[PDB]
Scaffold this active site. Structure first.
Site, PDB file in Angstrom:
ATOM      1  N   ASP B 108      46.196   2.213 -16.184  1.00 39.21           N
ATOM      2  CA  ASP B 108      45.107   1.716 -17.038  1.00 39.21           C
ATOM      3  C   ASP B 108      44.779   0.281 -16.636  1.00 39.21           C
ATOM      4  O   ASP B 108      44.463   0.051 -15.455  1.00 39.21           O
ATOM      5  CB  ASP B 108      45.508   1.925 -18.502  1.00 39.21           C
ATOM      6  CG  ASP B 108      44.349   1.721 -19.464  1.00 39.21           C
ATOM      7  OD1 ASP B 108      43.463   2.596 -19.529  1.00 39.21           O
ATOM      8  OD2 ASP B 108      44.324   0.678 -20.151  1.00 39.21           O
ATOM      9  N   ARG B 109      44.834  -0.698 -17.548  1.00 32.52           N
ATOM     10  CA  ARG B 109      44.491  -2.074 -17.197  1.00 32.52           C
ATOM     11  C   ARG B 109      45.427  -2.644 -16.139  1.00 32.52           C
ATOM     12  O   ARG B 109      44.996  -3.444 -15.301  1.00 32.52           O
ATOM     13  CB  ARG B 109      44.512  -2.968 -18.438  1.00 32.52           C
ATOM     14  CG  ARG B 109      43.851  -2.385 -19.669  1.00 32.52           C
ATOM     15  CD  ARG B 109      42.407  -1.988 -19.409  1.00 32.52           C
ATOM     16  NE  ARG B 109      41.552  -3.132 -19.119  1.00 32.52           N
ATOM     17  CZ  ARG B 109      40.242  -3.037 -18.919  1.00 32.52           C
ATOM     18  NH1 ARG B 109      39.651  -1.853 -18.979  1.00 32.52           N
ATOM     19  NH2 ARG B 109      39.527  -4.122 -18.666  1.00 32.52           N
ATOM     20  N   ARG B 112      44.274  -1.769 -12.794  1.00 37.22           N
ATOM     21  CA  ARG B 112      43.148  -2.587 -12.356  1.00 37.22           C
ATOM     22  C   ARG B 112      43.625  -3.921 -11.804  1.00 37.22           C
ATOM     23  O   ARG B 112      43.093  -4.407 -10.800  1.00 37.22           O
ATOM     24  CB  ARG B 112      42.161  -2.791 -13.507  1.00 37.22           C
ATOM     25  CG  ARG B 112      41.790  -1.490 -14.180  1.00 37.22           C
ATOM     26  CD  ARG B 112      40.514  -1.566 -15.002  1.00 37.22           C
ATOM     27  NE  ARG B 112      40.203  -0.241 -15.528  1.00 37.22           N
ATOM     28  CZ  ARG B 112      39.591   0.715 -14.837  1.00 37.22           C
ATOM     29  NH1 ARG B 112      39.182   0.492 -13.595  1.00 37.22           N
ATOM     30  NH2 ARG B 112      39.376   1.895 -15.392  1.00 37.22           N
ATOM     31  N   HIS B 153      34.398   2.351 -25.644  1.00 37.86           N
ATOM     32  CA  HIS B 153      35.099   1.101 -25.903  1.00 37.86           C
ATOM     33  C   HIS B 153      34.908   0.074 -24.795  1.00 37.86           C
ATOM     34  O   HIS B 153      35.222  -1.101 -25.010  1.00 37.86           O
ATOM     35  CB  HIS B 153      36.591   1.369 -26.127  1.00 37.86           C
ATOM     36  CG  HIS B 153      37.279   2.001 -24.957  1.00 37.86           C
ATOM     37  ND1 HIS B 153      37.011   3.288 -24.541  1.00 37.86           N
ATOM     38  CD2 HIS B 153      38.241   1.529 -24.128  1.00 37.86           C
ATOM     39  CE1 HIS B 153      37.768   3.575 -23.497  1.00 37.86           C
ATOM     40  NE2 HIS B 153      38.527   2.528 -23.230  1.00 37.86           N
ATOM     41  N   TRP B 154      34.394   0.475 -23.630  1.00 33.81           N
ATOM     42  CA  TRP B 154      34.075  -0.506 -22.600  1.00 33.81           C
ATOM     43  C   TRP B 154      32.908  -1.390 -23.026  1.00 33.81           C
ATOM     44  O   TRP B 154      32.920  -2.602 -22.781  1.00 33.81           O
ATOM     45  CB  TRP B 154      33.780   0.201 -21.275  1.00 33.81           C
ATOM     46  CG  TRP B 154      35.031   0.563 -20.501  1.00 33.81           C
ATOM     47  CD1 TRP B 154      36.154   1.174 -20.993  1.00 33.81           C
ATOM     48  CD2 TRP B 154      35.280   0.327 -19.109  1.00 33.81           C
ATOM     49  NE1 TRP B 154      37.081   1.338 -19.990  1.00 33.81           N
ATOM     50  CE2 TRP B 154      36.570   0.825 -18.825  1.00 33.81           C
ATOM     51  CE3 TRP B 154      34.535  -0.249 -18.072  1.00 33.81           C
ATOM     52  CZ2 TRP B 154      37.130   0.760 -17.550  1.00 33.81           C
ATOM     53  CZ3 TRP B 154      35.094  -0.314 -16.808  1.00 33.81           C
ATOM     54  CH2 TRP B 154      36.379   0.186 -16.558  1.00 33.81           C
ATOM     55  N   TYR B 217      38.497  -6.719 -21.884  1.00 34.07           N
ATOM     56  CA  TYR B 217      37.330  -5.869 -21.666  1.00 34.07           C
ATOM     57  C   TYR B 217      36.064  -6.690 -21.448  1.00 34.07           C
ATOM     58  O   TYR B 217      35.143  -6.235 -20.761  1.00 34.07           O
ATOM     59  CB  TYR B 217      37.166  -4.900 -22.841  1.00 34.07           C
ATOM     60  CG  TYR B 217      38.098  -3.709 -22.745  1.00 34.07           C
ATOM     61  CD1 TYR B 217      39.418  -3.797 -23.176  1.00 34.07           C
ATOM     62  CD2 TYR B 217      37.669  -2.509 -22.194  1.00 34.07           C
ATOM     63  CE1 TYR B 217      40.277  -2.716 -23.086  1.00 34.07           C
ATOM     64  CE2 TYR B 217      38.524  -1.422 -22.091  1.00 34.07           C
ATOM     65  CZ  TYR B 217      39.827  -1.531 -22.541  1.00 34.07           C
ATOM     66  OH  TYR B 217      40.681  -0.452 -22.439  1.00 34.07           O
ATOM     67  N   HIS B 278      45.606  11.268 -20.452  1.00 34.56           N
ATOM     68  CA  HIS B 278      45.515   9.944 -19.849  1.00 34.56           C
ATOM     69  C   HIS B 278      46.898   9.345 -19.599  1.00 34.56           C
ATOM     70  O   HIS B 278      47.136   8.741 -18.548  1.00 34.56           O
ATOM     71  CB  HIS B 278      44.676   9.026 -20.740  1.00 34.56           C
ATOM     72  CG  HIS B 278      44.437   7.663 -20.162  1.00 34.56           C
ATOM     73  ND1 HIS B 278      43.895   7.471 -18.908  1.00 34.56           N
ATOM     74  CD2 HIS B 278      44.657   6.427 -20.671  1.00 34.56           C
ATOM     75  CE1 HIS B 278      43.792   6.175 -18.670  1.00 34.56           C
ATOM     76  NE2 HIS B 278      44.248   5.518 -19.722  1.00 34.56           N
TER      77      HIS B 278
END
Lengths: 298, 297
Positions: B108-109, B112, B153-154, B217, B278
């Site tokens: 997830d984050r 990134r 939610h983005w 975000y 996920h």
């Protein structure tokens, strides 16, 4: 709550789907006005008197909004699709003897209006929409920049009860945030404070808030599907039509409004107004002038 | 009150120039860093970390501003919570442990942060694994009706403060629980260890922690997208051997084919789907551990 329509009567119109509340005034050919989100019929309070000199003006609360009854939704959000809302308002106008009328709508009410013009064009003499593009066009242009700008189209459409739970922590904050953020000044100065109380008191009810989320759920699914059928079949609005938008409003941030409506309506004229999203409150004089000339034209 | 789900692992407060980084450290061998995402903390690796510690020194770190790590002060550009800044801070932390060349796996984050790290400083990595993500640039470029409804939610968390912060405070226990359940295959919390769910919920109960998530975000909608854009236009790829895992009902493949997309970003990448939603390391911990153990060794 203050009476912002002095001289106008009050009526509860019964339909098969529930009662429609409306303020009634003026005399002449009937003209129906429809509000949007997150407002009620009182958003017309500064242009309705001017219109009341030539038309019998009916200022109605949308089904589920303000003081109108709240039909129970379903898995398809059927009562709050614009096609079902159009049929109920048609029913209400028949209760008053109006089977052929003029119609002007703002925000959600303008969406009920152009769907009404597509499903039953024989019911309208003329049609005016304020600061919108069709629901289909908002979704087809949903890129990164536009998703950030109208985030609430995706957020409010999330399945129950996620948006309803979040809005219940401080509902006064959200309604005041949405009203302020869409004006040009970016605050609440353009609104009559008595009108804000109407919006705040309506938004404070959790059943009204759920209804507004049902409205946005229909706008992401069934309303989109209905519009998609009409574009891909080449069905255009045959009713003479006026399209007004704010130079700093929502519809212009998506595309060029007149170019898009030409694809949807065979006989459309348009003009911008130096204002934000809330045309009849940010620019009452110029909106009323634009509406009077159009409806009284031919 | 919080259970320790990493028995045999130490606990390290690693100092950086931007704040401390908390980490559970265990195992033996070459170093391997594991990064979590939203809305979880480091404990999400607790079912796959012990198997990796049979072959590697495993460092399970909280992301900057997440869990128990310090929260650097943000600014107008959300600089400290951009993935480029998070990558630099974590390179600092690993240098405090003497690790200048290590293996990396993110989710997830944290995934990134991982590929941004591989793009900025590829010499720091031996191998890289990303779980159930596509590059941030690819999500925004594919933004349409279907994707805007799914990853709402983005756009929502990226709104200017304090709009998401105030709405998140309306029911924070419900929100963090609704995100965990709606992104699983089962549609409920039945795939998570209840003690892990606590860790996530008490972290989401701090309003300062929720502000960091919105800043993350907000960076993901702007600065992170601009940095991916320069690499895409310049034809820059990831030279590090890369493993891409995604869930058969996860976020990454619902709007692309993940291994096909990643081949445009990396010159040597293999991939595999996992029967999962996920949260790969908790919904399918044996399959995830098997692929990671094989890829890294």
């Amino acid at each position: 709550l203050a009476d912002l329509f002095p001289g106008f009567g009050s009526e509860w119109i019964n339909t098969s789907s529930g009662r429609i509340f409306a303020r009634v005034g003026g005399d002449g050919p009937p003209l129906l006005l429809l509000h949007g989100f997150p407002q009620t019929h009182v958003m017309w309070h500064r242009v309705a008197p001017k219109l009341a000199e030539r038309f019998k003006v009916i200022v109605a609360d949308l089904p589920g909004y303000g003081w109108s009854d709240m039909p129970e939704s379903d898995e398809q959000h059927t009562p709050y699709t614009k096609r079902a809302m159009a049929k109920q308002l048609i029913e209400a106008m028949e209760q008053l003897g109006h089977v052929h009328f003029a119609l002007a709508g703002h925000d959600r009410g303008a969406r009920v209006s152009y769907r009404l013009a597509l499903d039953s064009p024989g019911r309208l003499s003329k049609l005016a929409v304020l600061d919108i593009l069709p629901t289909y066009e908002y979704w087809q242009r949903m890129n990164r920049a536009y998703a950030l700008k109208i985030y609430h189209w995706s957020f409010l459409a999330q399945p129950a009860p996620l948006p309803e739970n979040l809005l219940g922590g401080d509902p006064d904050f959200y309604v005041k945030a949405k009203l302020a953020s869409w004006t040009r000044a970016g605050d609440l100065s353009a609104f009559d404070p008595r009108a804000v109380e109407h919006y705040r008191i309506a938004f404070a009810d959790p059943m009204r808030r759920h209804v507004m989320c049902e409205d946005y759920r229909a706008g992401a699914y069934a309303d989109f599907e209905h519009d998609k059928i009409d574009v891909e079949a080449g069905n255009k609005i045959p009713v003479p039509m006026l399209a007004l938008w704010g130079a700093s409003g929502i519809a212009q941030s998506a595309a060029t409004p007149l170019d898009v409506w030409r694809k949807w309506a065979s006989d459309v004229q348009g003009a911008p107004i130096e204002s934000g999203h809330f045309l009849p409150e940010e620019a009452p004089d110029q909106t009323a002038e634009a509406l009077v000339r159009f409806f009284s034209a031919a």
